[PDB]
Structure formats: C-alpha cells, structure tokens
Symmetry: C3
Amino acid sequence: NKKVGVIFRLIQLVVLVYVIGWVFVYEKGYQTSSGLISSVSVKLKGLAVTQLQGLGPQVWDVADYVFPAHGDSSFVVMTNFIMTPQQAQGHCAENPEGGICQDDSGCTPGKAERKAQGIRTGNCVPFNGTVKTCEIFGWCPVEVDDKIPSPALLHEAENFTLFIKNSISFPRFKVNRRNLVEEVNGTYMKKCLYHKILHPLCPVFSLGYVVRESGQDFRSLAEKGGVVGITIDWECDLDWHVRHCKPIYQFHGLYGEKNLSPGFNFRFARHFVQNGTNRRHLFKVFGIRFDILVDGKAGKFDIIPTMTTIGSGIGIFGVATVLCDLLLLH
Amino acid sequence: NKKVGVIFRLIQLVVLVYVIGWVFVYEKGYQTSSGLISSVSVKLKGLAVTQLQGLGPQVWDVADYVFPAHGDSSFVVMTNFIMTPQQAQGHCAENPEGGICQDDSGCTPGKAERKAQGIRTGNCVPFNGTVKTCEIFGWCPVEVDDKIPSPALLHEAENFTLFIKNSISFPRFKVNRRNLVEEVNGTYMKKCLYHKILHPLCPVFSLGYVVRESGQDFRSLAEKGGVVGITIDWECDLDWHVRHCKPIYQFHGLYGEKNLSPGFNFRFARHFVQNGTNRRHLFKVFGIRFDILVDGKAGKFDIIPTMTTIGSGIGIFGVATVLCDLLLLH
Amino acid sequence: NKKVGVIFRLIQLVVLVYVIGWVFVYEKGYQTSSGLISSVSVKLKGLAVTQLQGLGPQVWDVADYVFPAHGDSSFVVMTNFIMTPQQAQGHCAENPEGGICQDDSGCTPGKAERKAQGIRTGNCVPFNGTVKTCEIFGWCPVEVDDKIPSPALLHEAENFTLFIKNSISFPRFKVNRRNLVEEVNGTYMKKCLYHKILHPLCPVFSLGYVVRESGQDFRSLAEKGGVVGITIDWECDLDWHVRHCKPIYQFHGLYGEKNLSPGFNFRFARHFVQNGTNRRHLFKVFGIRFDILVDGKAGKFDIIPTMTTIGSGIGIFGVATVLCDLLLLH
Ligand SMILES: Nc1ncnc2c1ncn2[C@@H]1O[C@H](COP(=O)(O)OP(=O)(O)OP(=O)(O)O)[C@@H](O)[C@H]1O
Ligand SMILES: Nc1ncnc2c1ncn2[C@@H]1O[C@H](COP(=O)(O)OP(=O)(O)OP(=O)(O)O)[C@@H](O)[C@H]1O
Ligand SMILES: Nc1ncnc2c1ncn2[C@@H]1O[C@H](COP(=O)(O)OP(=O)(O)OP(=O)(O)O)[C@@H](O)[C@H]1O
Ligand SMILES: *[C@@H]1O[C@H](CO)[C@@H](O)[C@H](O)[C@H]1NC(C)=O
Ligand SMILES: *[C@@H]1O[C@H](CO)[C@@H](O)[C@H](O)[C@H]1NC(C)=O
Ligand SMILES: *[C@@H]1O[C@H](CO)[C@@H](O)[C@H](O)[C@H]1NC(C)=O
Ligand SMILES: *[C@@H]1O[C@H](CO)[C@@H](O)[C@H](O)[C@H]1NC(C)=O
Ligand SMILES: *[C@@H]1O[C@H](CO)[C@@H](O)[C@H](O)[C@H]1NC(C)=O
Ligand SMILES: *[C@@H]1O[C@H](CO)[C@@H](O)[C@H](O)[C@H]1NC(C)=O
Ligand SMILES: *[C@@H]1O[C@H](CO)[C@@H](O)[C@H](O)[C@H]1NC(C)=O
Ligand SMILES: *[C@@H]1O[C@H](CO)[C@@H](O)[C@H](O)[C@H]1NC(C)=O
Ligand SMILES: *[C@@H]1O[C@H](CO)[C@@H](O)[C@H](O)[C@H]1NC(C)=O
Ligand SMILES: [Ca+2]
Ligand SMILES: [Ca+2]
Ligand SMILES: [Ca+2]
Ligand SMILES: [Mg+2]
Ligand SMILES: [Mg+2]
C-alpha cells in the first residue's frame, strides 16, 4: 500500500529529526560535562547603634554582627539580642522556668535531668518578690528571655550591604571563573545594588532585598531569627567565549510553623577579667542566617561523546524501524 | 508448534509485567524527582562542673563547650580539656619533646624546622629538676599534655540534650518542610528522647545514645575525642499528603586505628588583659565532632516522565519480542 | 555470499567483545557502587614572630592564625594583618575614604547610606593636619588600610606544617577507612613531607608546597590573601583488600583578576576590659582560605548488577545483529 509506505517514511523522518535535534543538539550530547570546585567569601558592611534602657549606646560593626568571622558560606547576621552582663560563678537563684519551690525541703541537691541550669545546693531562695527558686551554683545573673523586644534592635541591618565573592574552577577543562565578571568593574561595584532584572551581575546585595526575594518579611524575621538560602548556578557552554559564563543567583526562605520553634537563635559568651575576677557577658542572639550553595556544570565539545550519541541515535533509529515494520506486519 | 507459541506468549507477558510493574510502578518512572536545599541548626542543653586540683570549680554551659556557638552542621562538643592558664610572652624553657640539651653550646639560636615552639635564644635552661631544655621566646607557661585525665572531666555530657532543627525546601515543586512534623508538638518536645523504634520523630537526642547508636562507647571517645556523623534522609512521595513526609535519622561512627593518632583534638586560646598585661588561657580540647549531612529527594507525578517511561517500555517490549522471534527461528 | 557472512561474524564478535570487555570488565558493571560519609580535621603546627614599629614582638601559634580553632574543612591561615588596638566608643574623626568636609555645614547628622562608619554628629573635625573628615560616634582608632606591608608579616607560614585527618565510611558495605593507611606509621609521621611522587601517603603538608602545587606563588598570595582547594579522592575496588584503598590528593588555586578585588581578607575584633573600660583590638587579616572537599566511590561485586549488565549486553547484541541483518538486506 502506498499510504503505508508514506506513513513509514513519515515515522522514519520523525525519529530522525528526534535523534538529530533533541538528543544531539538540545541535550548537548556532542559535549562532555564536568563539575566545579567552588569557594565563597562574604563581607558585610553596616553599622547599628543600639540604646539599651539604663545603659550607654552600643555600636555593632562588621566584626560584631557576623558570627563566623573568617568568613564561610553559612554565616549568621545578628538582628536582635538579649544581653546578660557581668556573669560570675556563685550560689544564687535559678530561672523560674526550671522549677518553683515553696520551701527548702522541696529542693533536692544535685543537677536537673533536663535543661540543667546548675548544681542545686538544696535551698529555696527568692528569685524575686513574688516567687522563689532553687539555689544553684553557676552564673549568678540569669538570662531572662521571657521578654523579647518587639522592635528589632539591629533593624538597620534590613538595608546593609553584603559582598559575595565566589571563585569556581573546572579542572577537567582547566577554566577558572569568578562572580566579578568582565561586565562588572570597580566603579560599578562602588554604587551598584543587586536587582533581579536591573542589576543581576552586581555582587552587592541588600539583606532586606534578599529576604524579600526569598519570600519573607525582614521585620518579622529580625524579631526572632530566620533562614535564607542563596544558590549560585554556573551553568554555561565552553564552546562560546568565557565572557558568556555568568552566575545566576536564586534566593529561598527556609521557614517552619510559627507556633512551634519560631526563628533561629543561639547563645554565645564573651569572657574577660575585671578587678582580678573572671567574668563574662552572655548574649542570646536571634538573627537571619544565610546559607550559600554553589552548583555548576560546564560542557565542552568532544569527539567521544559525539560518537557515542551518534551510535545511540543509530540504535534508536534501528529499533524504531523494526517496531514500525512489526506494526505494519500486523 | 503450539508450545513455541506458548513460550512466545509467556515471554511476552513476562516482559510486559516487567515493564509495567518494575520500571513504571516500582521505580516511580511516572514521577519526576528533585533535590532539596537544607539548613541545619543545633542547640545543646547541659552543664558540667569540673573541679581541678588546686583550682576552684569551673562551670561549662552551652556557650562554653559548643565552640561553633553561631550554629553549624559540623560542631564540636567539649568532653575533656587540658588547661594552661596565665600565659605571658617572655623567654622561658620549652617542652622536652622539642629537644633536650646538656649545655648552652648545644643550643642553636633560631626556630625549629618542625613543630616549632618558639625562637630559641640559645641558652639551655632547666625545665625542671632532672632535665634542661632550650630557652625560647613565646608563651612562658608551656602546655604539658603528656598526662591526660583518664576520667572525663565533662563526663556528664554523655547524657545532655541536643536539639536539631532541619529546614528543607524542594525548589521545583516549591514545598518547604521542617524536622518538626504534625505528630510533634510542644508538650512532646518538652519531654522526649529520640529512639529508633519508640520516638523516631522526637527532635531531642542524647549524646550518649547518639554515640552508642554509632557503635562506639562514649567513655573511650570522650577521653580522647571521637567523630560521629548524623545523616538525615527526606525521601518522600509528593503524590500523597505532606504529612506522610517524615525524616529518617541515621548514626555512623568515624574512627581510626587507636595506636596511630587516636581521637579528635584541637587547641584554642582565650586572650585577655590583666593588670595592664596581655595574657591568655590555653585549652587543648578532646571532644566529639558531630557532622550533620542532609540528603533527600521529592518525587511528584508528571506527564512527560510518564510518556518517556511508556515509550521506553514499548521499546524494550519490541526488542524482547524481536529477540524471542530470533531465538525461535534458530 | 561468503564475505557477507564473514562481515556479519566480524560485527558480531566486535559487539560481543564490546559488551563483555568495555561494559562489563572495564566499567565494572558487575560491581555495585556506593558513596561515603567523610569527616575532615585539620591541625597546623608553626610559629611566627612579628615585630611591629613602636610595639613589642608578637608571637602567633596554632591558636592564633587558625581562626577556625575548633577544626573545619574550610579554614583560614593568617598571613598578614593590620592591627588597630585600643579601640573605644566615642566621637572622633572618620576615615577619609567615607567623605571629606571643608566646613561643619557640609556634614549632615545621621548615618551613611553605604559603607557606614558611624553616626555623624554634624561636625567636621580634622582627621590629620591636611584634611578634615566628618565626626562620627564609633571606635575612635580608625583602621587605615591604605598601606599594606610589602613583606608578609607571617611569611614563615610559607613552610609551616599542616596535618589532615580524613575519616571516610561507605555505609552500604560498612567499611571505614582513614587517610592514615597501613603504610603510614608513627615514625613516618614524625619526619615526612607530602610530595606528589616521593611521599604521596604522608599526611603532613607544607603550606608553600600546597600553594605551589596549585599554580600560585606563596608570596603574592600571603601579601593580600589567596584561595586553595584540596580535593581528596577515595576511588577504590572493594574486591581487593582494604590495604589497596589509598586516598589521592589534588590542589587547585582559586584566583581572580588582580585589579578587581584581589585576594582574600576579613576583619575581626578581640574585646576586653582594661581599667574598667571596655576596649577592643581590631585586626584586618589577609590570609589563605583552604577548602577541603572529599569525594569517593566504592565498588563491590554483586549478583544483581552482574545480571542486569548481562541482560543489557544481550539486548545490545541482539539490536546490533538486527541492524547488521537489515544493512545486509539493503
Ligand atoms: N559588603 C560590601 N558592601 C559594599 N561594598 C563592598 C562590600 N565589600 C567590599 N566592598 C567594596 O568592594 C571593593 C573590593 O573589596 P575588597 O575585598 O578589596 O575589600 P577591601 O577594599 O580590601 O576592604 P575595605 O573595603 O574595607 O577597604 C572595595 O573597594 C569595597 O568598597
Ligand atoms: N537542646 C535541647 N534540649 C532540650 N530541649 C530543647 C533543646 N533546645 C530547645 N529545646 C526546647 O525546644 C523549645 C523550642 O526551641 P527554641 O529554639 O524556641 O528554644 P528557645 O526557647 O529559644 O531557647 P530556651 O529554651 O533556651 O529559652 C524550647 O522550649 C526548648 O525548651
Ligand atoms: N600539623 C602537624 N605537623 C606535623 N606533625 C603533626 C601535625 N599534627 C600532628 N602531628 C603529629 O602527628 C602525631 C599524631 O597526631 P595527634 O592527633 O596524636 O596529635 P597530638 O599528639 O594529639 O597533638 P600534639 O602533637 O600537638 O601534642 C603527633 O605526634 C604529632 O607530632
Ligand atoms: C517574679 O518572677 C516571675 C517569673 O515568672 C513573674 O511571673 C513575676 O511577675 C515576677 N514578680 C515581680 C514582682 O517581678
Ligand atoms: C533602608 O535603606 C535606606 C537607604 O536609602 C535607609 O535610609 C533606611 O534606613 C533603611 N531601612 C532600615 C530599616 O534600616
Ligand atoms: C562598569 O560596569 C557597568 C556594568 O553595568 C558598565 O555598564 C560600565 O560601562 C562599566 N564602566 C566602565 C568605565 O567600563
Ligand atoms: C622532668 O620532666 C621530664 C620530662 O619528660 C620528666 O621525664 C621528669 O620525670 C621530670 N622530673 C621531675 C622531677 O618532675
Ligand atoms: C545519664 O543520664 C542520667 C539521667 O537519668 C543521669 O542521671 C546520669 O548522670 C547520666 N550519666 C552521665 C555519665 O552523665
Ligand atoms: C504530642 O505529640 C505526641 C507524639 O507522640 C502525640 O502522641 C500527642 O497526642 C501530642 N499531644 C497533643 C496534645 O496533641
Ligand atoms: C592626611 O590623610 C590623607 C588621607 O588620604 C593623606 O592623603 C594625607 O597625606 C595625610 N597628611 C598627612 C600630613 O599625614
Ligand atoms: C622554608 O623552609 C625552611 C626549612 O628548611 C625554613 O628554613 C625556611 O625559613 C622556610 N621559609 C620561610 C619563608 O619560612
Ligand atoms: C614507616 O612507613 C614507611 C612508609 O614510607 C615505611 O617505608 C617504613 O617501613 C615504616 N616503618 C616501619 C618501622 O614499619
Ligand atoms: Ca565556624
Ligand atoms: Ca567559628
Ligand atoms: Ca579583660
Ligand atoms: Mg527561654
Ligand atoms: Mg603532645
């Protein structure tokens, strides 16, 4: 039948176009692909002045609010803090969250099984005028974090600046690239701010802009902590010039249920010696932590992947022809 | 022959069941899978009181034994420490390991090529009553770590509490999940300990339980250091409700030969100013390094993977039928 | 035709050797492969003495120039530093890089939009004899990074010693390995330096040798910072003894353009209390960031991958025979 042969030739040309256009060209079969080794450095620029009640103003700079100082892909920026200063070791009242005692007989000498705050001496001492708590041995100024400041102390960190330097290298093709592309210059970095459409290559990011692109509000996050993830994609074709290779930045907000464990917080202490006595300042910091992940793949023309793709296409063509012949046989 | 056709139809139905059940249903070929972006936060709750010989009691809290105080997937929990306090710069005797001298002529001014402890002034000064060492310029109190306390100072850290908050997000399908699930509530988080069978969803882990699940005794590791790895798997099917998505926690113990460099140890110093002089307290810490790795994928139904799997199954069926016909022809 | 059958048998034997030799033996298709969980610890041993102008000699040890003192795969080794000591919070002249004022009217009370150095009080005070800058409320000793020392202060770090402890475990085959192979012993670790050909198994690395293997000169990097990446490959065959499993070390230099943001640098501060006043010492550190990445494969013989490879080879053989018959028919 003539129409049967026409349909056969149609299937032939269809599978030919499929194997020549989709596999070979669209999927870049004619090339070999390799991954990269990446290194990320972060630098924050911004200053925050916080005026605590009954205390002098405190200035926080790059060395203050960025917790990992050397610089890492995962870093925490301080947004709010509860400060307990002049902590010294002694026998003193514990926090009421641990337990409340009405008499000394209720207290038991030892340490609490869970969430221990110290070694209970065995006496019930008044924590304040109303309630009394067990006397424990430890840092006498107890961090009381029941009250969290509604306005963020380091609210200016909403619009500070962040510079991310990402250096990637493909060793298979021996090609090293950096986020500071040829289009980016010094005068550009002097005044540019990153934008999704306007300034994609600008390496200067605003923290509030990053949080908004992630899908979260900075003010709510700065109150109790947050998690933002920055993904850097280096997908490019090495057949073209190296100037075409440009990184793509994506922002995601990692959040959970608000009623259970909201935000991100940690406790750190600074130890010093004053008047011959060892003391420490404790800080419970709620901040927005940024995790940077870089993933990229470089593909360059090679003869062996091309030959393998040609062989696979010939095999698929043969299988399709055999299946079409079996269908026409009925 | 009828038996030939029976065997042919048998092979046909076998390969049909294979392509319809294994590749499609079992391997979830109709679904497409995507990776996740994950962030991990750790919080330690526990307190250790250490009484050193000829020194007042020392209290260690979350700020103390957690050196990555900011919060990272890889963190070290202090289990034992050797303390050298009141280190000041000056010309003093070095450790015997660097070298033992009997006269000043044996000493050579300069710095050691390997394991340099300081700048040798060139005079042999008595390190103690028996042996004499080269005088070097540096921290005068030299840390002597020949004696390691057999009972772990922070042995209570065996049964402290650890809270791990893991937030994962699959960008393609735009689904965000957290280690805390609907089954987990606040009252549950108040009092629960993780177990492989009893409490698989409890986010509170005991350090001793974590180490024992890794096949390691807590005492021997805490004495000289250890390495524990926690892997979090988020394998789930997005065709069902998100409530079914639950993570799986697995514990591994990374250990080496005991005679050659046993355990994990590091050294850190705290600098301060006392009486107008800059001094420091040095600590050689033997602890357990916890490395947290999160790996998971999400699979959801899609039409293009379904069509590709159907095409591949039809092709495999055709190839199998052709091979069976060729075998029957022989 | 006889030659037709000869060519058919030739194609048959060729595809048979291909499926049995390349797909089965060469690619190890009969072996199933699994990944590993790895942990890396770093220890630096070196001493550097720096004599600043008008200041006493400063000694830097492992606790000093290793800012990630706890021990991480990514660590920074200090090579040069600019020190601004005795910083106190007050009203003082700002750095001239922010702005230069000729009168008090030019100053505006508030904070700078970009690169803010403090809160301007609206007064123009002389920064030095020639120029005047805006008066800001912050740390009064201003870090002036215009002059960078041409010779690296911590130049000795060129030939210090780095020890890496890498513990890997393949969970599927429950096999744990460490970089301290059977060939390496304690006496060997006492005196050895890693070499690409001479001492591949020695776990002691010289920083200068590591940087030179990455194609970078240590002097120019130590002057203003650098980035080195160490990759550890654990590819091995579990069919043989575990002694044959040995790690391979590769070094990659991650560098960028020199005119635009050269090297790696960061700022850190040490806070203390002197004479009842809280002060801090600021340090701008230019160092070499070492990023350690470990990736490995373990292959062990299994029956199911063997059967799958045999089936795939039989299918490819059948397809090749069918295609050859179709070509001969033409
Ligand atoms: N977080 C940031 N926000 C805005 N600009 C930045 C930031 N980090 C760096 N820059 C700008 O990028 C340029 C190159 O950065 P580089 O790493 O060389 O810093 P630097 O000049 O050594 O340090 P500093 O900027 O403190 O003098 C600098 O001139 C600086 O002004
Ligand atoms: N390591 C831990 N061990 C036991 N319980 C913990 C731990 N970390 C947190 N929790 C409990 O989980 C609950 C929610 O955790 P969240 O991150 O909000 O702690 P928090 O309330 O900010 O810190 P804290 O309980 O110290 O004030 C808290 O009520 C706390 O009691
Ligand atoms: N960075 C390094 N350079 C040279 N040798 C090292 C280095 N780190 C460790 N070693 C040597 O390897 C041996 C085993 O390492 P181990 O982890 O036991 O060190 P350690 O004895 O705990 O610490 P230290 O040697 O500082 O007292 C030690 O005897 C030490 O001399
Ligand atoms: C004392 O502390 C408890 C702690 O919960 C608090 O409820 C109470 O209001 C406090 N009383 C006063 C007078 O501050
Ligand atoms: C937002 O950025 C602007 C810069 O024009 C700044 O004036 C403002 O204070 C920033 N907002 C906050 C809350 O800091
Ligand atoms: C600086 O970079 C920008 C990139 O947007 C470019 O348009 C501009 O021409 C550059 N400046 C110079 C002087 O090349
Ligand atoms: C002196 O120190 C050396 C160091 O090895 C030690 O062997 C010796 O016993 C010490 N002597 C005394 C009296 O402490
Ligand atoms: C183990 O946990 C129990 C809690 O019941 C505690 O009493 C005990 O002290 C812990 N062991 C150590 C060595 O801390
Ligand atoms: C708390 O969580 C546990 C999980 O085991 C569950 O059994 C219990 O019902 C929950 N409590 C409430 C009040 O929902
Ligand atoms: C004052 O500081 C400026 C800052 O750029 C500098 O150019 C100038 O040479 C300095 N003058 C003196 C006398 O130090
Ligand atoms: C290089 O190593 C040698 C060891 O023989 C040492 O003498 C020299 O000081 C080192 N170079 C530097 C710059 O430290
Ligand atoms: C120490 O290790 C080296 C590895 O190069 C080996 O040649 C030597 O025999 C070992 N020493 C002993 C005593 O086994
Ligand atoms: Ca860190
Ligand atoms: Ca750190
Ligand atoms: Ca002090
Ligand atoms: Mg609380
Ligand atoms: Mg030692």
